[PDB]
Amino acid sequence: GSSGSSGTGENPYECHECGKAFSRKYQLISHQRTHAGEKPSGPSSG
Ligand SMILES: [Zn+2]
């Protein structure tokens, strides 16, 4: 279909890696676990 029903309204907890959003703090931490493994390319790079 063509009905993009997003689910982002009250999410005071957003991931500082990708940009996800969660209702509670833990709800976010559990996600960050996926990023855990290697550091991205920030400083000293493009
Ligand atoms: Zn993330």
Side-chain angles (χ1 to χ4, degrees):
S2 58
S3 298
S5 293
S6 60
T8 180
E10 303 281 330
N11 288 307
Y13 308 91
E14 271 150 27
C15 186
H16 57 240
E17 303 199 61
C18 61
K20 195 160 270 201
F22 313 72
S23 210
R24 324 210 67 164
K25 177 76 162 172
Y26 92 96
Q27 292 198 13
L28 161 52
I29 283 75
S30 187
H31 168 80
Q32 304 199 302
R33 308 294 274 178
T34 75
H35 287 291
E38 72 280 335
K39 302 190 199 197
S41 64
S44 309
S45 200

